[PDB]
Paper text:
Among these applications, antitumor treatment with therapeutic antibodies is primarily based on antibody-dependent cellular cytotoxicity (ADCC), which is promoted through interaction between the Fc region of immunoglobulin G1 (IgG1) and Fcγ receptor IIIa (FcγRIIIa) on the surface of immune effector cells, such as natural killers and macrophages. The Fc region of IgG1 possesses one conserved N-glycosylation site (Asn297) in each CH2 domain, where a bi-antennary complex-type oligosaccharide is expressed with microheterogenities resulting from the presence or absence of non-reducing terminal fucose, galactose, and sialic acid residues. Namely, removal of the core fucose residue from Fc glycans causes dramatic enhancement of ADCC through improved IgG1-FcγRIIIa interaction. Crystallographic studies have indicated that binding of IgG1-Fc to FcγRIIIa is mediated not only by protein-protein interactions but also by carbohydrate-protein and carbohydrate-carbohydrate interactions.
For crystallization, we used a soluble form of FcγRIIIa (sFcγRIIIa), which consisted of the extracellular domains and possessed two N-linked oligosaccharides at Asn45 and Asn162, while the remaining three N-glycosylation sites were mutationally eliminated. In this crystal structure, electron density of the Asn162 glycan was again largely unobservable. In this context, the results of our MD simulations indicate that core fucosylation of Fc glycan also intramolecularly perturbs the amino acid residues in close spatial proximity, as best exemplified by Tyr296, which neighbors the N-glycosylation site in Fc chain A. The aromatic ring of Tyr296 of nonfucosylated IgG1-Fc is sandwiched between the Asn162 glycan and the Lys128 side chain of sFcγRIIIa. In the presence of the IgG1-Fc core fucose, this major conformational state is significantly less populated, giving rise to divergent minor conformational states, which are exemplified by χ1 dihedral angle of −55° and also by direct contact with the fucose residue in Fc chain A glycan. In the crystal structures of the IgG1-Fc/ sFcγRIIIa complexes, clarity of electron density of the sFcγRIIIa Asn162 glycan depended on the presence or absence of the core fucose residue of the IgG1-Fc glycans. Our REMD simulations successfully extrapolated this missing information, revealing that the Asn162 glycan is stabilized in solution mainly through carbohydrate-carbohydrate interaction with the nonfucosylated form of Fc glycan, which, however, is sterically hindered by the core fucose of Fc.
Numbering used by the authors:
A (entry chain A), C (entry chain B): 230 to 444
B (entry chain C): 10 to 30, 42 to 52, 56 to 73, 76 to 174
Write the structure that this text describes.
């Protein structure tokens, strides 16, 4: 449908981290990266539009020389947490002499009705208690959109050794995922408490946690 | 014994024209020479006569998307070094990088020759080029350049 | 209209399905796919090699018109189960008039010490028992390579209402995944035994089963 472009700089527009959009102590940023800027036309211009309304206040970094002898230039627009969640479009317009016409890229939060995750912690299987380490599982399902943050905690500090699957599309159009916390078996049997924490837009205070311990 | 264009390393389907002051691999020809659309068989040693018998001049025909052409591979300090990143059928090449010893040295949005006007000992190393034919990443083979005094 | 296709066609070479390599009754296939074949130069010639030696048993599929006026053109080589698992390289060589030379592509099983999967079934959280469906969970971890197949059954019949996460790289270089089977709560309350079936080269007879029921 769209006739393909020739050489020239290229533009990549990146959204904010989910966890940054949801906790108000954090500062979420939209990031507009221009690569393949030649030394012959190294000057790059960033215009930034929210829903159509130009904004200024974007903080443009200075061009950095890449190992392949091209320039790379980043512009970082700080975003208001609620503007992102209400789903306002963010537009990076990149202008440069090697471009016949400026390049525009747009991003926004995935559209669709938000849905609250259900969170269930699952102890280690009985068969696993044979091993030196064991697996505490946190199942998170029924969420939409797929934007989410999941962490494990214990005694107020973040647990180290955990991996979380990518979001998977369940058959009702919602998403689930699983996160696995691996701990030494001593800590489980000695009876410490482990929490699985979940941040998602459709939860009250964008937060919930669920405890897990032996009994 | 003159090549038009000068490039002794060429690609399949490249036009060559050959000027005199013919023997192909020491053997007689059809005519008294235009290579319309080269093939690997057109490679080898070439010599000329109508005058005396000329020196031996080599024509290498290669297979590939890209070929790093030059008038020679050994240069004097301060000589001009002309590189052409030649694409098969002159197919449009974009985002072209010329590399030296594994590091991009010059970048071009559209294909362009990389002319170094004044060679130095820093310019010794292995070079290749690369780029995009549409959406396809393609690279030429390497060629060793060495700089002497 | 037509696209320019300046670089000619591209090749994507795909492996067999994990279950097809592991059950002797099934037929594993390597599939060479060629895209961006033009209308004007549509013929594709295939040469197939196993550890460098040419083989002639490949199947030629009719070419397929795509909705951008190119052909998708495919060749399918069935393979020997043991060869694939023994790490034989399968080379697809693709010839077309819009290329300066043949494109060659290779594929083998991932290399490195195979590691046995550990399989663990996990009953629903007590908090899910209020719902009308429950989630039975199968954790499969500690396996290498990532090639694996997971299915569920009850009482000699397949249970198909499940979803499985992709394999995830764990911190020791092995892989894990979760599979979630969703069943009507009545069925779990009746005392029915559900089973997680896992296939992987590092298992005995390429097969193992763990079971899960009300206690
Ligand atoms: C010359 O070199 C440069 C750079 O050099 C590099 O460094 C050297 C040493 C080498 O290692 C070299 O290989 C390195 O690249 C080359 O520049 C590269 O150019 C290519 C394109 O040719 C770019 O490739 C795209 O990458 C995208 C992903 O990029 C991110 O991830 C990679 C790793 O996978 C990182 O390396 C990048 O830096 C990017 O990482 C992200 O950066 C963000 C901004 O900082 C981070 O977000 C921010 O995080 C901070 C916190 O730090 C805050 O929280 C902010 O709020 C937050 O915004 C983010 O965390 C970080 N991610 C990480 C770390 O994972 C791909 O998306 C893209 O693919 C899309 O586009 C292709 C078209 O070309 C297409 O084919 C793909 O299919 C895909 O399609 C698109 O899909 C998207 C979404 O799915 C849709 O928009 C579209 O539908 C669709 N099509 C589109 C948009 O057209 C490419 O793979 C590469 O990023 C770029 N590198 C860098 C560093 O800029 C250059 O090419 C070289 N030139 C030559 C001539 O050789
Ligand atoms: C014109 O149109 C055509 C048709 O396009 C399509 O139709 C229209 C309507 C659109 O909707 C469009 O989106 C459709 O796709 C275009 O054709 C496409 O071209 C792109 C490239 O431009 C191809 O993209 C690659 O896809 C690979 C994965 O492909 C599979 O998955 C997708 C879905 O995700 C399917 O749609 C594909 O068909 C492939 O599906 C697989 O097919 C196999 C064979 O059928 C199946 O295996 C077999 O299964 C059967 C049963 O059916 C038997 O059991 C057999 O035993 C078994 O063999 C398999 O199951 C099936 N999977 C499914 C369905 O899930 C990507 O892997 C690839 O990415 C790699 O390469 C990129 C380079 O371009 C690079 O960016 C990536 O990083 C990645 O690179 C690799 O990374 C890995 C590690 O991550 C490394 O190991 C590698 O080293 C590394 N580099 C490589 C390999 O170079 C591509 O994204 C796309 O496949 C193709 N479509 C089709 C249908 O073939 C065409 O481009 C358009 N042209 C123009 C000019 O517009
Ligand atoms: C003047 O002198 C020069 C310099 O000596 C000659 O250059 C030589 O030309 C040869 C062919 O014309 C070049 O051969 C090519 O390069 C490969 C070297 O690695 C070579 O392996 C290839 O050779 C083919 O023929 C062999 C059979 O005898 C095969 O072993 C080989 O695989 C190739 O044949 C094909 O193989 C595939 C396998 O899948 C078959 O399916 C095909 O059917 C086979 N045939 C065809 C037609 O494809 C390759 O062609 C040689 O390298 C080159 N040397 C140099 C240094 O450049 C000039 O030709 C000569 N000029 C004249 C007019 O005589
Ligand atoms: C082509 O492939 C090389 C090899 O990995 C990579 O470094 C390069 O950036 C790719 N793209 C271009 C345009 O050169
Ligand atoms: Cl990202």
């Amino acid at each position: 449908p769209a006739p393909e472009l020739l050489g020239g700089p290229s533009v990549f527009l990146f959204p904010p981290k989910p966890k940054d959009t949801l906790m108000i102590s954090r500062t979420p940023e939209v990031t507009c990266v221009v690569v393949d800027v030649s030394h012959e036309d190294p000057e790059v211009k960033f215009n930034w539009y929210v829903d159509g309304v130009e904004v200024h206040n974007a903080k443009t970094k200075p061009r950095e020389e890449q190992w392949n002898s091209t320039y790379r230039v980043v512009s970082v627009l700080t975003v208001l947490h609620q503007d992102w969640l209400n789903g306002k479009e963010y537009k990076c317009k990149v202008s440069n002499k090697a471009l016949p016409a400026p390049i525009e890229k747009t991003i926004s939060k995935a559209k669709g009705q938000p849905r609250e995750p259900q969170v269930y912690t699952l102890p280690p299987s009985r068969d696993e208690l044979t091993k030196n380490q064991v697996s505490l599982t946190c199942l998170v399902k029924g969420f939409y959109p797929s934007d989410i943050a999941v962490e494990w905690e214990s005694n107020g500090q973040p647990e180290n050794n955990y991996k979380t699957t990518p979001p998977v599309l369940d058959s009702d159009g919602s998403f689930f995922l699983y996160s696995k916390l691996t701990v030494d078996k001593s800590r489980w049997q000695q009876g410490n408490v482990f929490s699985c924490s979940v941040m998602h837009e459709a939860l009250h205070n964008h937060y919930t946690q669920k405890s897990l311990s032996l009994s | 014994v003159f090549l038009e264009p000068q490039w002794y390393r060429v690609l399949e389907k490249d036009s060559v024209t050959l000027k005199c002051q013919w023997f192909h691999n020491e053997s007689l020809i059809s005519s008294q020479y235009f290579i319309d659309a080269a093939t690997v068989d057109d490679s080898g040693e070439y010599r000329c006569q109508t005058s005396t018998l000329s020196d031996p001049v080599q024509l290498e025909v290669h297979i590939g998307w890209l070929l790093l052409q030059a008038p020679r591979w050994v240069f004097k300090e301060e000589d001009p070094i002309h590189l052409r990143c030649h694409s098969w059928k002159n197919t449009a090449l974009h985002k072209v990088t010329y590399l030296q010893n594994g590091k991009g040295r010059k970048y071009f949005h559209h294909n362009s020759d990389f002319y170094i006007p004044k060679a130095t000992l820093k310019d010794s190393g292995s070079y290749f080029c690369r780029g995009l034919v549409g959406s396809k990443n393609v690279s030429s083979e390497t060629v060793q350049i060495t700089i002497t005094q």
